[PDB]
């Protein structure tokens, strides 16, 4: 690409993997939201909350795709796998699963930051710190608070 | 389900398949939108248009999920397959592909309506007619006009 | 009638029966509301909700009478039967009874649609679909959610 | 009832009878309104007027039910009989029938007031005087004026 | 056509015939309006009413032409025949003629719906129901009311 | 007619012929407008322009009918012939056809003015000059400009 500068191939591949992971998280939250819409579950607040989270994850994936184009990398999409469960069994179980998911996403982002540091890419490091790391910390803390209160 | 009335199992399965198809269409449009965001393509109008279409398809899938819960069926999600291409060679090619996709979705909806008619489910028939059939006709007409003008 | 066209006698009779059924539903909801108005029950939210439902059912009956006049049929009213209970033991029991009633009304409407389809009366079919079927589905789902939460 | 004071059983029964009578009057007025909605009658002003009267009678019945709960009595509903005619031959005939009906309702209310006076129930006497007697006198006078003008 | 899907040739031909019929109805109403504009007739209310009806019929014809293009059919126009009368002897006679005309148009629309049902075209069925059937029923009822009052 | 003064029979007949010609022009413009609405043509600006022209021609015909009643003549309507073609091969060809049509209408109006001058009817002469001649000149000039630019 005519715009590409200081952008390693490994960073491009890692960004594509993170795009897929964010799309997967959006899918999981969609599944949870419509689990709580069932007539035999009927918890409107949980359904609304998880739908909002699904849309937020979609926005995160789109931001990563924009970043990939900005640095001159090329987007390669993969299948979005279906969630692990169809029935999420309770609000507490759903919140615990969401906490586990957000911690896994955080670990992926931290590995990406380590890669960018190893490749001496300060722009990618700052992008990850500014747009992903504190949001993940805040989300994890909010989910932990919810789990404590539901327990 | 305590709410289930005049809802055949085949209709429930077909609604789940349609949910997956709408999610797939949203994914395809997202891919097209960010193809036109590349620095070596750089057509902002096409990128914005296809992103809008992706969001619309996501809304259609959510409406189908809501219907499934309303009638007392149970949602079962599947993998969302990757689109057929990564490179959508041109605006005209992308529009032609979108036209083909919308015609395929229309055929699926017509088969769904035939199934609902065969099972004597007037509510499902009216749902499909009111919320999907005319929107599909209008979308196909608009895409045909775009293809003619781009040719 | 000078306005009559494509309106079978059986459809006219079935519309009269449906008018009586809607009036009966209104009466049942009135009874429930003023059960919850008692000093030894004293649940204002349930009383208000069931009074609103009674008025809605009255409006549905009036719409059917208007339709009968529009198509050139003649209205024949019958006695509105007393509800099955005077004492609606609890909010959960009242909601379960309302769910049963709305499902019975839905079955009557579906039989009406089948009759209109058999007599090739598309206007009556569309009238039933547009003004009664989706409202019945939504009401049944709402009542199911209420029953789940009260249980 | 914990709230019951100076409320005779005969008064409770008479209030239930009056509730049924008001519901019957509402039904009669509904029949009259949709008679004038017919295409071979087509008098919009009469249809609107009698529909308004039907709704007013429904409100009167609801006020009596509220009173029954206020004094600690228990509501017992009965069948609402269908009106005496399906065809209300003309506007003048309909007005004459409405006048006869309102005079019958007035006689029932006067017998109720006599019963309340005999049982030394000043609250019930004042309730009947304040909310029913003058309204009945005014309605009878208005109907008489209408009958004179239509004659 | 690149947009054509599930659109039978017979449906296309029937839509063209309906376009011609709507244009004819508009012409008839124009003739009636300017009959009532004559100095030896001089009924301004009838002239205004029938001119409004003529414009409405023109709009209906244009909507059918739009539908023909949406489904990928091709419009073929025919001569618009002159009305059966030059002198519409009275307001009552004009209203009776308009009632007869609207009933004929309704019969044509019902035959169109039957054809669309036989060819398994749910989109055309819903188009006819939503945009033409109830409007025809309402117009016929209004004309019947007018005829009754004028008689 | 009681209002008729200085209105020759020949003028009445010529006004009827002009009414038919204006209706024909409206029909031609409608055909053009919906030619450009086709999915394989898809020129929205031309469709909008020619629809506006069709409505304008209808207004001109109505004004002539009003004049015929004002002077005491009697309107006699004739068949509106279908346009000369179904396919208006291009925007330039459609504009050229419209120019030819407007020149033919202008020639008809000039012959009408000559007849009115020969019959010493100054009111009809002024009516034609004020409401038709300059509008025709302006329309012809606008169409000529459009043809030059499209060439």
mmCIF file of N, CA, C and O in Angstrom, chain E residues 1-3 20 23 27 30-31 33-40 51 54-55 58 62-63 65-66 69-70 72-83 86, chain F residues 1-3 20 23 27 30-31 33-40 51 54-55 58 62-63 65-66 69-70 72-83 86:
data_model
loop_
_atom_site.group_PDB
_atom_site.id
_atom_site.type_symbol
_atom_site.label_atom_id
_atom_site.label_comp_id
_atom_site.label_asym_id
_atom_site.label_seq_id
_atom_site.Cartn_x
_atom_site.Cartn_y
_atom_site.Cartn_z
ATOM 1 N N UNK E 1 -36.553 -8.695 -17.424
ATOM 2 C CA UNK E 1 -36.013 -7.662 -16.551
ATOM 3 C C UNK E 1 -35.097 -8.264 -15.491
ATOM 4 O O UNK E 1 -35.338 -9.358 -14.977
ATOM 5 N N UNK E 2 -34.028 -7.531 -15.168
ATOM 6 C CA UNK E 2 -33.091 -7.960 -14.136
ATOM 7 C C UNK E 2 -33.726 -8.043 -12.751
ATOM 8 O O UNK E 2 -33.183 -8.736 -11.885
ATOM 9 N N UNK E 3 -34.849 -7.360 -12.518
ATOM 10 C CA UNK E 3 -35.483 -7.351 -11.204
ATOM 11 C C UNK E 3 -36.629 -8.346 -11.093
ATOM 12 O O UNK E 3 -37.157 -8.539 -9.992
ATOM 13 N N UNK E 20 -55.885 0.710 -17.130
ATOM 14 C CA UNK E 20 -56.864 1.324 -18.024
ATOM 15 C C UNK E 20 -58.194 1.578 -17.316
ATOM 16 O O UNK E 20 -58.811 2.632 -17.514
ATOM 17 N N UNK E 23 -57.979 4.682 -15.098
ATOM 18 C CA UNK E 23 -58.010 5.899 -15.910
ATOM 19 C C UNK E 23 -59.430 6.196 -16.399
ATOM 20 O O UNK E 23 -59.874 7.355 -16.393
ATOM 21 N N UNK E 27 -61.865 9.541 -15.781
ATOM 22 C CA UNK E 27 -62.544 10.275 -16.852
ATOM 23 C C UNK E 27 -64.039 10.431 -16.565
ATOM 24 O O UNK E 27 -64.615 11.511 -16.774
ATOM 25 N N UNK E 30 -64.579 13.089 -13.945
ATOM 26 C CA UNK E 30 -64.397 14.418 -14.532
ATOM 27 C C UNK E 30 -65.646 14.876 -15.283
ATOM 28 O O UNK E 30 -66.095 16.028 -15.122
ATOM 29 N N UNK E 31 -66.218 13.980 -16.093
ATOM 30 C CA UNK E 31 -67.456 14.297 -16.797
ATOM 31 C C UNK E 31 -68.574 14.682 -15.832
ATOM 32 O O UNK E 31 -69.281 15.671 -16.066
ATOM 33 N N UNK E 33 -68.346 15.912 -12.745
ATOM 34 C CA UNK E 33 -68.055 17.198 -12.119
ATOM 35 C C UNK E 33 -68.458 18.352 -13.027
ATOM 36 O O UNK E 33 -69.180 19.276 -12.615
ATOM 37 N N UNK E 34 -68.032 18.302 -14.287
ATOM 38 C CA UNK E 34 -68.351 19.444 -15.132
ATOM 39 C C UNK E 34 -69.784 19.417 -15.647
ATOM 40 O O UNK E 34 -70.256 20.436 -16.160
ATOM 41 N N UNK E 35 -70.500 18.297 -15.505
ATOM 42 C CA UNK E 35 -71.949 18.373 -15.654
ATOM 43 C C UNK E 35 -72.565 19.229 -14.561
ATOM 44 O O UNK E 35 -73.421 20.075 -14.840
ATOM 45 N N UNK E 36 -72.150 19.023 -13.318
ATOM 46 C CA UNK E 36 -72.708 19.830 -12.239
ATOM 47 C C UNK E 36 -72.181 21.261 -12.237
ATOM 48 O O UNK E 36 -72.710 22.100 -11.501
ATOM 49 N N UNK E 37 -71.171 21.563 -13.055
ATOM 50 C CA UNK E 37 -70.742 22.948 -13.240
ATOM 51 C C UNK E 37 -71.642 23.763 -14.181
ATOM 52 O O UNK E 37 -71.492 24.987 -14.238
ATOM 53 N N UNK E 38 -72.572 23.140 -14.908
ATOM 54 C CA UNK E 38 -73.374 23.873 -15.886
ATOM 55 C C UNK E 38 -74.271 24.909 -15.209
ATOM 56 O O UNK E 38 -74.631 24.781 -14.037
ATOM 57 N N UNK E 39 -74.633 25.955 -15.966
ATOM 58 C CA UNK E 39 -75.444 27.027 -15.392
ATOM 59 C C UNK E 39 -76.886 26.588 -15.165
ATOM 60 O O UNK E 39 -77.572 27.150 -14.303
ATOM 61 N N UNK E 40 -77.367 25.609 -15.927
ATOM 62 C CA UNK E 40 -78.711 25.081 -15.741
ATOM 63 C C UNK E 40 -78.754 23.901 -14.781
ATOM 64 O O UNK E 40 -79.818 23.297 -14.610
ATOM 65 N N UNK E 51 -64.890 16.171 -8.843
ATOM 66 C CA UNK E 51 -63.531 16.506 -9.271
ATOM 67 C C UNK E 51 -62.490 15.886 -8.341
ATOM 68 O O UNK E 51 -61.466 15.349 -8.800
ATOM 69 N N UNK E 54 -62.173 12.291 -9.244
ATOM 70 C CA UNK E 54 -61.410 12.097 -10.475
ATOM 71 C C UNK E 54 -59.909 12.124 -10.199
ATOM 72 O O UNK E 54 -59.154 11.260 -10.675
ATOM 73 N N UNK E 55 -59.460 13.112 -9.421
ATOM 74 C CA UNK E 55 -58.035 13.177 -9.093
ATOM 75 C C UNK E 55 -57.577 11.953 -8.298
ATOM 76 O O UNK E 55 -56.479 11.425 -8.539
ATOM 77 N N UNK E 58 -57.019 9.094 -10.644
ATOM 78 C CA UNK E 58 -55.759 9.260 -11.368
ATOM 79 C C UNK E 58 -54.576 8.807 -10.515
ATOM 80 O O UNK E 58 -53.660 8.129 -11.006
ATOM 81 N N UNK E 62 -51.747 5.827 -11.281
ATOM 82 C CA UNK E 62 -50.303 6.036 -11.209
ATOM 83 C C UNK E 62 -49.636 5.043 -10.260
ATOM 84 O O UNK E 62 -48.532 4.559 -10.547
ATOM 85 N N UNK E 63 -50.282 4.729 -9.134
ATOM 86 C CA UNK E 63 -49.727 3.728 -8.225
ATOM 87 C C UNK E 63 -49.614 2.364 -8.898
ATOM 88 O O UNK E 63 -48.620 1.650 -8.708
ATOM 89 N N UNK E 65 -49.180 1.835 -12.108
ATOM 90 C CA UNK E 65 -48.060 1.920 -13.048
ATOM 91 C C UNK E 65 -46.722 1.768 -12.322
ATOM 92 O O UNK E 65 -45.819 1.050 -12.786
ATOM 93 N N UNK E 66 -46.589 2.425 -11.167
ATOM 94 C CA UNK E 66 -45.391 2.262 -10.351
ATOM 95 C C UNK E 66 -45.178 0.806 -9.954
ATOM 96 O O UNK E 66 -44.047 0.312 -10.000
ATOM 97 N N UNK E 69 -43.757 -1.219 -12.857
ATOM 98 C CA UNK E 69 -42.310 -1.056 -12.998
ATOM 99 C C UNK E 69 -41.533 -1.715 -11.860
ATOM 100 O O UNK E 69 -40.446 -2.255 -12.093
ATOM 101 N N UNK E 70 -42.057 -1.679 -10.632
ATOM 102 C CA UNK E 70 -41.342 -2.295 -9.517
ATOM 103 C C UNK E 70 -41.144 -3.787 -9.730
ATOM 104 O O UNK E 70 -40.067 -4.314 -9.435
ATOM 105 N N UNK E 72 -40.923 -5.390 -12.497
ATOM 106 C CA UNK E 72 -40.249 -5.693 -13.736
ATOM 107 C C UNK E 72 -41.141 -5.941 -14.933
ATOM 108 O O UNK E 72 -40.638 -6.367 -15.976
ATOM 109 N N UNK E 73 -42.446 -5.698 -14.816
ATOM 110 C CA UNK E 73 -43.340 -5.750 -15.949
ATOM 111 C C UNK E 73 -43.221 -4.497 -16.805
ATOM 112 O O UNK E 73 -42.575 -3.518 -16.447
ATOM 113 N N UNK E 74 -43.866 -4.548 -17.967
ATOM 114 C CA UNK E 74 -43.830 -3.446 -18.914
ATOM 115 C C UNK E 74 -45.234 -2.909 -19.166
ATOM 116 O O UNK E 74 -46.158 -3.658 -19.494
ATOM 117 N N UNK E 75 -45.372 -1.596 -19.019
ATOM 118 C CA UNK E 75 -46.653 -0.911 -19.151
ATOM 119 C C UNK E 75 -47.018 -0.823 -20.628
ATOM 120 O O UNK E 75 -46.192 -0.426 -21.456
ATOM 121 N N UNK E 76 -48.250 -1.200 -20.960
ATOM 122 C CA UNK E 76 -48.822 -0.963 -22.280
ATOM 123 C C UNK E 76 -50.168 -0.267 -22.129
ATOM 124 O O UNK E 76 -51.127 -0.862 -21.631
ATOM 125 N N UNK E 77 -50.230 0.985 -22.570
ATOM 126 C CA UNK E 77 -51.418 1.813 -22.430
ATOM 127 C C UNK E 77 -52.378 1.584 -23.592
ATOM 128 O O UNK E 77 -51.969 1.230 -24.700
ATOM 129 N N UNK E 78 -53.667 1.787 -23.326
ATOM 130 C CA UNK E 78 -54.731 1.669 -24.313
ATOM 131 C C UNK E 78 -55.566 2.954 -24.323
ATOM 132 O O UNK E 78 -55.416 3.820 -23.456
ATOM 133 N N UNK E 79 -56.452 3.077 -25.312
ATOM 134 C CA UNK E 79 -57.358 4.219 -25.359
ATOM 135 C C UNK E 79 -58.218 4.273 -24.104
ATOM 136 O O UNK E 79 -58.669 3.247 -23.587
ATOM 137 N N UNK E 80 -58.442 5.483 -23.610
ATOM 138 C CA UNK E 80 -59.378 5.720 -22.520
ATOM 139 C C UNK E 80 -60.726 6.052 -23.141
ATOM 140 O O UNK E 80 -60.888 7.108 -23.764
ATOM 141 N N UNK E 81 -61.688 5.150 -22.984
ATOM 142 C CA UNK E 81 -62.993 5.321 -23.600
ATOM 143 C C UNK E 81 -63.765 6.459 -22.935
ATOM 144 O O UNK E 81 -63.647 6.707 -21.733
ATOM 145 N N UNK E 82 -64.568 7.154 -23.739
ATOM 146 C CA UNK E 82 -65.400 8.219 -23.204
ATOM 147 C C UNK E 82 -66.526 7.632 -22.352
ATOM 148 O O UNK E 82 -66.951 6.496 -22.569
ATOM 149 N N UNK E 83 -67.018 8.385 -21.369
ATOM 150 C CA UNK E 83 -68.077 7.866 -20.495
ATOM 151 C C UNK E 83 -69.354 7.558 -21.262
ATOM 152 O O UNK E 83 -69.537 7.947 -22.418
ATOM 153 N N UNK E 86 -73.261 11.904 -21.482
ATOM 154 C CA UNK E 86 -72.891 13.309 -21.416
ATOM 155 C C UNK E 86 -73.693 14.077 -20.378
ATOM 156 O O UNK E 86 -73.152 14.974 -19.730
ATOM 157 N N UNK F 1 -78.758 28.236 -23.852
ATOM 158 C CA UNK F 1 -78.436 28.577 -22.474
ATOM 159 C C UNK F 1 -78.824 30.018 -22.162
ATOM 160 O O UNK F 1 -78.709 30.907 -23.008
ATOM 161 N N UNK F 2 -79.297 30.242 -20.933
ATOM 162 C CA UNK F 2 -79.665 31.582 -20.488
ATOM 163 C C UNK F 2 -78.481 32.542 -20.437
ATOM 164 O O UNK F 2 -78.697 33.758 -20.440
ATOM 165 N N UNK F 3 -77.247 32.039 -20.389
ATOM 166 C CA UNK F 3 -76.069 32.891 -20.273
ATOM 167 C C UNK F 3 -75.400 33.137 -21.622
ATOM 168 O O UNK F 3 -74.487 33.961 -21.708
ATOM 169 N N UNK F 20 -60.130 17.735 -25.937
ATOM 170 C CA UNK F 20 -59.601 16.401 -26.216
ATOM 171 C C UNK F 20 -58.094 16.431 -26.462
ATOM 172 O O UNK F 20 -57.370 15.547 -25.989
ATOM 173 N N UNK F 23 -56.194 16.712 -23.157
ATOM 174 C CA UNK F 23 -56.193 15.430 -22.452
ATOM 175 C C UNK F 23 -55.209 14.446 -23.087
ATOM 176 O O UNK F 23 -54.491 13.726 -22.374
ATOM 177 N N UNK F 27 -51.906 12.499 -21.417
ATOM 178 C CA UNK F 27 -51.663 11.059 -21.513
ATOM 179 C C UNK F 27 -50.273 10.743 -22.069
ATOM 180 O O UNK F 27 -49.589 9.844 -21.551
ATOM 181 N N UNK F 30 -47.706 11.332 -19.389
ATOM 182 C CA UNK F 30 -47.736 10.248 -18.405
ATOM 183 C C UNK F 30 -46.963 9.029 -18.903
ATOM 184 O O UNK F 30 -46.170 8.426 -18.157
ATOM 185 N N UNK F 31 -47.183 8.662 -20.170
ATOM 186 C CA UNK F 31 -46.452 7.542 -20.758
ATOM 187 C C UNK F 31 -44.944 7.769 -20.698
ATOM 188 O O UNK F 31 -44.186 6.869 -20.313
ATOM 189 N N UNK F 33 -43.220 9.753 -18.641
ATOM 190 C CA UNK F 33 -42.772 9.740 -17.255
ATOM 191 C C UNK F 33 -42.544 8.321 -16.766
ATOM 192 O O UNK F 33 -41.508 8.030 -16.159
ATOM 193 N N UNK F 34 -43.486 7.420 -17.028
ATOM 194 C CA UNK F 34 -43.277 6.070 -16.527
ATOM 195 C C UNK F 34 -42.379 5.225 -17.423
ATOM 196 O O UNK F 34 -41.944 4.153 -16.992
ATOM 197 N N UNK F 35 -42.071 5.677 -18.642
ATOM 198 C CA UNK F 35 -40.959 5.055 -19.351
ATOM 199 C C UNK F 35 -39.646 5.290 -18.622
ATOM 200 O O UNK F 35 -38.836 4.366 -18.490
ATOM 201 N N UNK F 36 -39.414 6.509 -18.142
ATOM 202 C CA UNK F 36 -38.144 6.762 -17.468
ATOM 203 C C UNK F 36 -38.080 6.184 -16.055
ATOM 204 O O UNK F 36 -37.013 6.226 -15.432
ATOM 205 N N UNK F 37 -39.180 5.632 -15.547
ATOM 206 C CA UNK F 37 -39.214 4.932 -14.267
ATOM 207 C C UNK F 37 -38.769 3.474 -14.369
ATOM 208 O O UNK F 37 -38.564 2.833 -13.334
ATOM 209 N N UNK F 38 -38.603 2.940 -15.577
ATOM 210 C CA UNK F 38 -38.218 1.547 -15.750
ATOM 211 C C UNK F 38 -36.834 1.290 -15.154
ATOM 212 O O UNK F 38 -35.977 2.173 -15.103
ATOM 213 N N UNK F 39 -36.626 0.054 -14.690
ATOM 214 C CA UNK F 39 -35.353 -0.309 -14.076
ATOM 215 C C UNK F 39 -34.204 -0.338 -15.077
ATOM 216 O O UNK F 39 -33.049 -0.166 -14.674
ATOM 217 N N UNK F 40 -34.490 -0.552 -16.357
ATOM 218 C CA UNK F 40 -33.473 -0.551 -17.400
ATOM 219 C C UNK F 40 -33.318 0.807 -18.076
ATOM 220 O O UNK F 40 -32.571 0.915 -19.053
ATOM 221 N N UNK F 51 -43.905 13.784 -15.439
ATOM 222 C CA UNK F 51 -45.113 13.689 -14.618
ATOM 223 C C UNK F 51 -45.676 15.075 -14.300
ATOM 224 O O UNK F 51 -46.899 15.292 -14.361
ATOM 225 N N UNK F 54 -47.496 16.268 -17.319
ATOM 226 C CA UNK F 54 -48.794 15.616 -17.475
ATOM 227 C C UNK F 54 -49.856 16.283 -16.606
ATOM 228 O O UNK F 54 -50.971 16.569 -17.073
ATOM 229 N N UNK F 55 -49.520 16.549 -15.341
ATOM 230 C CA UNK F 55 -50.485 17.223 -14.472
ATOM 231 C C UNK F 55 -50.827 18.627 -14.979
ATOM 232 O O UNK F 55 -51.996 19.042 -14.921
ATOM 233 N N UNK F 58 -53.349 18.348 -17.732
ATOM 234 C CA UNK F 58 -54.679 18.081 -17.188
ATOM 235 C C UNK F 58 -55.340 19.362 -16.683
ATOM 236 O O UNK F 58 -56.536 19.587 -16.924
ATOM 237 N N UNK F 62 -58.929 21.126 -17.894
ATOM 238 C CA UNK F 62 -59.992 21.522 -16.974
ATOM 239 C C UNK F 62 -60.361 22.993 -17.139
ATOM 240 O O UNK F 62 -61.545 23.348 -17.065
ATOM 241 N N UNK F 63 -59.369 23.859 -17.367
ATOM 242 C CA UNK F 63 -59.671 25.268 -17.612
ATOM 243 C C UNK F 63 -60.516 25.458 -18.867
ATOM 244 O O UNK F 63 -61.441 26.281 -18.874
ATOM 245 N N UNK F 65 -62.657 23.272 -20.077
ATOM 246 C CA UNK F 65 -64.010 22.828 -19.735
ATOM 247 C C UNK F 65 -64.763 23.904 -18.952
ATOM 248 O O UNK F 65 -65.949 24.174 -19.215
ATOM 249 N N UNK F 66 -64.076 24.544 -18.001
ATOM 250 C CA UNK F 66 -64.679 25.652 -17.267
ATOM 251 C C UNK F 66 -65.108 26.772 -18.209
ATOM 252 O O UNK F 66 -66.198 27.331 -18.058
ATOM 253 N N UNK F 69 -68.345 25.894 -20.043
ATOM 254 C CA UNK F 69 -69.532 26.148 -19.228
ATOM 255 C C UNK F 69 -69.787 27.638 -18.999
ATOM 256 O O UNK F 69 -70.949 28.055 -18.945
ATOM 257 N N UNK F 70 -68.737 28.449 -18.855
ATOM 258 C CA UNK F 70 -68.949 29.878 -18.632
ATOM 259 C C UNK F 70 -69.682 30.527 -19.795
ATOM 260 O O UNK F 70 -70.568 31.358 -19.577
ATOM 261 N N UNK F 72 -71.747 29.160 -21.868
ATOM 262 C CA UNK F 72 -73.016 28.531 -22.161
ATOM 263 C C UNK F 72 -72.958 27.396 -23.160
ATOM 264 O O UNK F 72 -74.013 26.882 -23.546
ATOM 265 N N UNK F 73 -71.766 27.001 -23.603
ATOM 266 C CA UNK F 73 -71.642 25.832 -24.444
ATOM 267 C C UNK F 73 -71.786 24.547 -23.649
ATOM 268 O O UNK F 73 -71.824 24.541 -22.421
ATOM 269 N N UNK F 74 -71.871 23.437 -24.374
ATOM 270 C CA UNK F 74 -72.029 22.126 -23.765
ATOM 271 C C UNK F 74 -70.853 21.223 -24.121
ATOM 272 O O UNK F 74 -70.490 21.061 -25.287
ATOM 273 N N UNK F 75 -70.271 20.624 -23.088
ATOM 274 C CA UNK F 75 -69.084 19.784 -23.208
ATOM 275 C C UNK F 75 -69.508 18.439 -23.786
ATOM 276 O O UNK F 75 -70.477 17.832 -23.319
ATOM 277 N N UNK F 76 -68.788 17.973 -24.806
ATOM 278 C CA UNK F 76 -68.946 16.622 -25.338
ATOM 279 C C UNK F 76 -67.571 15.964 -25.396
ATOM 280 O O UNK F 76 -66.728 16.346 -26.212
ATOM 281 N N UNK F 77 -67.357 14.974 -24.533
ATOM 282 C CA UNK F 77 -66.067 14.307 -24.428
ATOM 283 C C UNK F 77 -65.944 13.196 -25.465
ATOM 284 O O UNK F 77 -66.946 12.630 -25.912
ATOM 285 N N UNK F 78 -64.709 12.888 -25.848
ATOM 286 C CA UNK F 78 -64.397 11.823 -26.794
ATOM 287 C C UNK F 78 -63.312 10.914 -26.213
ATOM 288 O O UNK F 78 -62.712 11.210 -25.178
ATOM 289 N N UNK F 79 -63.068 9.796 -26.895
ATOM 290 C CA UNK F 79 -62.008 8.877 -26.492
ATOM 291 C C UNK F 79 -60.666 9.596 -26.449
ATOM 292 O O UNK F 79 -60.349 10.406 -27.323
ATOM 293 N N UNK F 80 -59.877 9.300 -25.425
ATOM 294 C CA UNK F 80 -58.498 9.768 -25.356
ATOM 295 C C UNK F 80 -57.615 8.685 -25.961
ATOM 296 O O UNK F 80 -57.467 7.601 -25.386
ATOM 297 N N UNK F 81 -57.036 8.972 -27.122
ATOM 298 C CA UNK F 81 -56.238 7.986 -27.833
ATOM 299 C C UNK F 81 -54.927 7.714 -27.098
ATOM 300 O O UNK F 81 -54.348 8.593 -26.457
ATOM 301 N N UNK F 82 -54.455 6.469 -27.204
ATOM 302 C CA UNK F 82 -53.181 6.118 -26.596
ATOM 303 C C UNK F 82 -52.030 6.745 -27.372
ATOM 304 O O UNK F 82 -52.146 7.003 -28.572
ATOM 305 N N UNK F 83 -50.904 7.008 -26.709
ATOM 306 C CA UNK F 83 -49.772 7.651 -27.389
ATOM 307 C C UNK F 83 -49.231 6.792 -28.523
ATOM 308 O O UNK F 83 -49.546 5.609 -28.666
ATOM 309 N N UNK F 86 -44.826 3.086 -27.059
ATOM 310 C CA UNK F 86 -44.662 2.639 -25.683
ATOM 311 C C UNK F 86 -43.257 2.878 -25.151
ATOM 312 O O UNK F 86 -43.092 3.139 -23.956
#
